[PDB]
Symmetry: D2
Subunit: 316 residues, 4 copies
Amino acid sequence: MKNNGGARVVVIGAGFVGASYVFALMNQGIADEIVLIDANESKAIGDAMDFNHGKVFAPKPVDIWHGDYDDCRDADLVVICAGANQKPGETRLDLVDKNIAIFRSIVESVMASGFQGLFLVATNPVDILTYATWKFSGLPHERVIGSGTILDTARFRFLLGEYFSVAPQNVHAYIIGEHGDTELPVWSQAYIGVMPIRKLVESKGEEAQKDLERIFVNVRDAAYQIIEKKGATYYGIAMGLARVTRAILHNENAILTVSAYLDGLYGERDVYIGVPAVINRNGIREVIEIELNDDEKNRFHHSAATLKSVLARAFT
Amino acid sequence: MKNNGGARVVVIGAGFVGASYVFALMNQGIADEIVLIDANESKAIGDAMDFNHGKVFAPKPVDIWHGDYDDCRDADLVVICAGANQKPGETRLDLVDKNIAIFRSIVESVMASGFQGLFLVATNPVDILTYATWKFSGLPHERVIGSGTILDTARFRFLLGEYFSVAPQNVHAYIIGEHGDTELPVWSQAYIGVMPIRKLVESKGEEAQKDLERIFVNVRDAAYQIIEKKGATYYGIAMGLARVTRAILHNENAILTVSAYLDGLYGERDVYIGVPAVINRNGIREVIEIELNDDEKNRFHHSAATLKSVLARAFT
Amino acid sequence: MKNNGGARVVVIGAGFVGASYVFALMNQGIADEIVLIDANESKAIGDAMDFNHGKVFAPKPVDIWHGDYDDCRDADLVVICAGANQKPGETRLDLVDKNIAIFRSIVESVMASGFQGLFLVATNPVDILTYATWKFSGLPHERVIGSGTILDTARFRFLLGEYFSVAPQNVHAYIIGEHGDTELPVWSQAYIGVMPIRKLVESKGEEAQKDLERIFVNVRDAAYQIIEKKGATYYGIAMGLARVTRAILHNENAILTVSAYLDGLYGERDVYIGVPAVINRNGIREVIEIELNDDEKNRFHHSAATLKSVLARAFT
Amino acid sequence: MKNNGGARVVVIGAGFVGASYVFALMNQGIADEIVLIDANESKAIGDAMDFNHGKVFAPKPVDIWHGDYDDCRDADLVVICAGANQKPGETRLDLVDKNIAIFRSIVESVMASGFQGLFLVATNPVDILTYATWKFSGLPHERVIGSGTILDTARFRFLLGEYFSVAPQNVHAYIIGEHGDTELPVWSQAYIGVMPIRKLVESKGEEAQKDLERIFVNVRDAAYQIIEKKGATYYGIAMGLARVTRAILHNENAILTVSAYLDGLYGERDVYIGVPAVINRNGIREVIEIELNDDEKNRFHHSAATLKSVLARAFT
Ligand SMILES: NC(=O)c1ccc[n+]([C@@H]2O[C@H](COP(=O)([O-])OP(=O)(O)OC[C@H]3O[C@@H](n4cnc5c(N)ncnc54)[C@H](O)[C@@H]3O)[C@@H](O)[C@H]2O)c1
Ligand SMILES: NC(=O)c1ccc[n+]([C@@H]2O[C@H](COP(=O)([O-])OP(=O)(O)OC[C@H]3O[C@@H](n4cnc5c(N)ncnc54)[C@H](O)[C@@H]3O)[C@@H](O)[C@H]2O)c1
Ligand SMILES: NC(=O)c1ccc[n+]([C@@H]2O[C@H](COP(=O)([O-])OP(=O)(O)OC[C@H]3O[C@@H](n4cnc5c(N)ncnc54)[C@H](O)[C@@H]3O)[C@@H](O)[C@H]2O)c1
Ligand SMILES: NC(=O)c1ccc[n+]([C@@H]2O[C@H](COP(=O)([O-])OP(=O)(O)OC[C@H]3O[C@@H](n4cnc5c(N)ncnc54)[C@H](O)[C@@H]3O)[C@@H](O)[C@H]2O)c1
Ligand SMILES: O=P(O)(O)OC[C@H]1O[C@](O)(COP(=O)(O)O)[C@@H](O)[C@@H]1O
Ligand SMILES: O=P(O)(O)OC[C@H]1O[C@](O)(COP(=O)(O)O)[C@@H](O)[C@@H]1O
C-alpha cells in the first residue's frame, strides 16, 4: 500500500543525496510510500510537492509526503542522508565530530518511534556513521547498512567498462575498505567476462599497467574531482542507494559491496567496512570473504586500522 | 546506437531543470544518447561524471557526456533549459529581454550545428521563448514544441486525484493558455472516470464548489509556493519534459497540453500558447480545439491577449 | 521475498490464459513469488522450468515454482484460469455446467489452504464463475474480482485509438455489462481526451456514425474472429489480468471495468457484472455508477437479466 | 516511429518461440514496430489482434501487424523462428535438411525485400541454420547471429544461482560450443561473484564435485525434460532472444554467448558456434577468445568437429 500496507521507505536528510535518492525511486518505481523527514521542514515540504506534481508521469504510483518520526514505526527501511558535506579540501573523516552528533538524535527519534526495519546510512563518514547507527540503535549489525563502497565500485566498473569498451555491467571488479581514501581495487579478482583483467593487459606491458593504475586513482578521487567541479556529488550515490534498496524490498540476495560489520571475517574485528555481502529482505544475509593477495591483505588491513582509530577516539 | 546511432537528446542548460530532466531520462531509460551543453562547462562536466557513475545501475544502457553544438548536427531533439530563473518574490515574465537574448545565440549555434530534429523549450516564460526559438530557428512551428501547460495539468490531476481519491491518472481535466498567471482550468470538460466533475460535485454546492476553485488556485500558485519553500521548481517539470520526450521518441500520438502555435484555432493566430495537441515523432500533429464555455472562451482569449503584448513588445 | 515475504500470486491453471499471464508478470517485474497449480503436473512442471531458465534476463528478480494448495495460505492473489474454454461454435455460457464443477474443488482446496487474500477469476463465463467463486468462498464480495469487461474495454480503445489515430491510452470509453454477447458500449460517456466522441464524428461525412457502430461489432465479436484464426484467445486477457494485478498489489485506486457485485447500484442486485470500479489493495473499494442513457440503461438491464437466469438456473 | 521511423523487428514464424518472443518484447518495451510473417497467415492474423488487444496496457507504445517481406526492406532486425520443432526422442540435428530447405526461401525472400539489417537465427539446429542464413544471405558474417548458447547459459546460471543461493544474475559462468549435445560448461573460468566456483566447492570435495556435474547434465538435457513434460520449449529462448535484441537495438556492447563465426579464434575456422562475443548496433563486434583448460579445449574442438561434419553434407 501507498496507503499504509506497502513498501514504506523513510528518508531522513533531504538535501542533494536525499532528494536525488527519492527522485530515482520514483522514476524507478521502487517504494510504495516514501517519507521525507528533514530539519529544514520547508525543504522537506517544497521537495514533496515538487515530487507529487510530476507523479502523473512516473512509471508507477507511489505515495510521497513530508513526515515525522512516527512515520518510522511502520516504515521498512530508514535511509539517512542528513548531515555535513565535505567542502573542497576536506576529507571524509573531517566530519566525524559533526555527524555522529546528529546521529544520536536522528537514530534516537526513529527508535523511539517504535521502528524495526533496516537502516541504510549514506552520510560521511559512511563507515564511522554506520557503526554509530548500529550502536545508537542496538539492533543487529545485520540490519544497519552503509552505502560503503557501492558508489566507488560502480565508478570502477564504469571506468574499466570504458577502457575495454564493454558494458560496465559486464565488468567484474570491486573496491573495498573505507569508503574514502584507504579504499582498494581488488585487481587480483577483477574480470571482464570470465577472462581475468590482469591477463588481457599482460599482453600490453607497462601500459595496461600504468593505464590500470590511472583508473584506480580517478576512481579514488572521483568525489574531489566532482566536488571541485560542481560542489557536491549525489547522482552517483542516489543510484547506488536505489540499487541497494531493491535488493532488500525484493529480497534479492544480490552480492553488493556495502558497509558490513566484521568480527574476524577479514582477519579484522569490531569494524564496519566495505566488503561483499549477500543483501536480502532481512538486511545482510552474510559477508563474503574473498581471496586477497598479500598486497591486498595489507592495504585492506591498513584501511581497517585507519577506521579503527577514528572510532577509538570518536565515540559520541 | 550508444555510439552515434540512436536517440540523441541534447540538453542545453544543465542547471536544475536541466539535470533533473537528464536524471529522469536515465532512470526511465528513455534516450540512447544524452549530451550536455552548459555555458558553465565545469557544471556540465561534474554532472556528466556524476551521471555515468550510477549507470551500471541504470535501468537501460544510456550514453551521457558533455558536448558542444556540433553534437546537435546529429540530434532528434534539443531541449532548452538554459537562461535565467525567475527569482523569489514574484517574477516570471520579467525574464524576457534576458532570455530572448540567450535564445538568440543557442538557436544559432545549434541550427549552425546543421540540426534538423525537434526543439523542446523549457526556459521561462516558456511560451514567449517557444516563439523566439521558432522565429530564430525558422523551422516550421510544428517542430518547435514548448512545455507550456504540461506541469499545471499534472498538478490539477494530482490535486483532484487527491480531493477525489483516485489515481491522478484517472482524473481527466486540463489547464491551458498561458503557463503563468493567465492560465485557465477547463471545468466544462473535467472528468473523473467518464463522469463529469461538475455533477459529481453536482450534489453538494458551495462546498464541493468552493473546493474546486481552491484546488485550481493552488495549481496556479504552485511554483510561487515551492520557490518560497525550496527556492526553485524542477522535479515536476523534469517529469514533464520526460513525458513529451517519449511522445516524440516513440511516435505515440499522445495528447499533451503543450505550447503550440495558433493560426485561427482558438480564435487566435501568431501565438504559441498552452493547448492540447497530438504529439508524435514529427512534432505536433495538430492542435486539438476543445469546446469552451463562454466563460473559458473569455479567459483564454484574455490570456492570449496578454502574451501577444510581450511579443509585440520584446522582439525586434 | 522471492523467499516467502514478497507479493505472492498463485495461478490455478497454467494453460494458455494462465501461463501467458505468468509470462506477463515476469517481463513486467510485477510480483515477488509466482506459484503455479495446474491439474496437469508435467505441464505445470514443464513451464515453471521454462519460466526459470529465462529470468536471468528478467528485469526483476521473481521466484517462480510449481506449487500446491498449502502455497495458498500466504499468497496475496489467487488467479483462476482453469477449466473448459469455448470451442469454435460455442459461446461463453455453454461452459457453465462444465466449469462450476471445477470451481467447487478449487475454491474449496484454496479456502482450506488457510487462504485469506483476494480472488481474481478469468475462466468463462467470467461473471457466473465470479459469483460462484464468492459464494463457495463465503468471502465478502469485494474480495472476489472477475476480469469482466477489462478486455472488452481494451479492444474498444485499441480500435477507437486506431480510427481517430490517437493512443489507445488517449481514448476514454467503456464496454459494460456481461463479458459475452449482451455487453454494451456506453457511447454517451466516451471521449478522445476531453472531447465527446459523438461530436468529433458530429462533423463527419461517410458515417463516422456507421463506422463507430461497426467498431463495437468488432469489439463484441473479437473472441470469435480470434478463436477462428488461432484456436483460443489468451494474450489480450493476459494483459488485462496483469493490469488489475497491478491495481491491487500497488494499492492503486485505479478505475477499472471488472466483474463486480451490485447491491442496488445500477438498479440491479445480487449479480456479478462488468461495471467501472475503483481497485486497490483490499479488493474493490466501490462500484462507480456512471450515468447511462435510456438505450444503455436498457441493455445494461437486459444483460443483468440474462445473467441472473444462469445464476438462477445453474447453481452448482 | 510506431510509424515507419524507428526500430522495426520482423518475426518469420509466429510459432511458440516466435510468438513468445513478441510477448517478451512488447511487455519489456523493446521494439517500435513488430511485423509477423507466418506460412499460415491466420496464425499471424490471430496473434497480431491478440497482441493489439492488450497493448493499451503494454508499458510502451509498440505497433504489431501481419506484414510481408517488403516490410523487411526497412527492417533493423529480422529474427527467424519458422520451421520444424524437434520431436521427443529426436535430436537437434535430425531437423537439418528439413530446416535448410526452408531457410533458402525465407532468406532469399527477405534479401529480395532489399533487406539490409541484421539476422537473429533461432531455428534448430541453430549453429547449422545460422551458417545457412549467412551462406544464403551473402551478407558479412558479423550480421548473421544465431542464439547459440544463450539459453544453455541462462540455464547454468539459474541452477548454480540456486545451488549457491545467490541471484543468478550473480553467477558468472558459460556454456560454449554447439547448442546441443556437444556443448560444454566452461568450468575453468566460472565464478559466483568474484570468487571461483571450483574454490567454493573446494572445501566439501566430491560432494560439491558430484553436485556440480548433475547441474551440468540438467543443463545439457533441459531441452528434453521440457520437450517431454510440455512438448516444446519457448519461454527461455524468448527471453534470450529479447536480450540479444536489446543488445543490438541499444548498441550496448554486451558480452553474450552467441553462435558466431570462427575464423581462427578457438583454433577453429569456417564454422558458426556458441562463443562469448561483444554485440552492438552493427551485430557482432568480435568473438571473445577466453582461456580453456585442456579438457574444455578438447570438447570445444570436438563440438566444432561435429558442427563441421553436418555442414559438409548439409549444403541445401
Ligand atoms: N557515502 C557516500 O557515498 C556519499 C556520497 C555523497 C554524499 N554523501 C554524504 O551525504 C551527506 C550530506 O549530503 P548532501 O550533499 O546532500 O548535503 P545536504 O545539505 O544537501 O543535505 C543534508 C540535509 O540534512 C538535513 N539535516 C541536518 N540536520 C538534521 C537533523 N538533525 N535531523 C534531520 N535532518 C537534518 C538538512 O536539513 C539538510 O537538508 C554528507 O555527510 C556526505 O558525506 C555520502
Ligand atoms: N517550463 C516550466 O514549466 C519551468 C518549470 C520550472 C523552471 N523553469 C525555467 O527553467 C529555466 C532554467 O532553470 P533552472 O531553475 O534550472 O536554472 P539554473 O540557473 O539552475 O540553470 C540554468 C542553466 O543555464 C545555463 N546557461 C545560461 N546561459 C547559457 C548559455 N548561453 N548556454 C548554456 N548554458 C547556459 C546556466 O549556467 C545554468 O546552469 C528558468 O528560466 C525557469 O523559469 C521552467
Ligand atoms: N475472462 C476472459 O476475458 C477470458 C479471455 C480468454 C479466454 N478465457 C477463459 O479462460 C478459460 C481457460 O483458458 P485457456 O485457453 O488457458 O484454457 P486451456 O485449456 O488452455 O487451460 C486450462 C487449464 O486448466 C487446467 N485445469 C483443468 N482442471 C483443473 C483443476 N481442477 N485445477 C487446476 N487446473 C485445472 C488444464 O489442465 C489447463 O492447464 C476458459 O474458460 C476461457 O473461456 C477467458
Ligand atoms: N535456439 C533455441 O534455443 C530454440 C529453443 C526452442 C525451440 N527452438 C527452435 O524453434 C523452432 C520452431 O519453434 P516452435 O516450437 O515455436 O515451432 P512452431 O511450429 O510453433 O512454429 C514454427 C512456425 O514456422 C512457420 N513456418 C514454417 N515454414 C515457414 C516458412 N517457410 N516461412 C514462414 N513461416 C514458416 C509455421 O507455420 C509455424 O508458424 C524449432 O525448429 C526449434 O529448433 C529453438
Ligand atoms: O558478466 P556476466 O556474467 O555476463 O553477467 C552480467 C550481470 O552481472 C551484473 O553486472 C552484476 O555484476 P556483479 O556480480 O559484479 O555485481 C548484472 O548487472 C548483469 O546482468
Ligand atoms: O487523456 P489523458 O488525460 O492524457 O489520460 C491518460 C491517462 O489515462 C489512462 O489511459 C487511464 O485511462 P482511463 O481513465 O480511461 O482508465 C492512463 O493510462 C493514462 O496515464
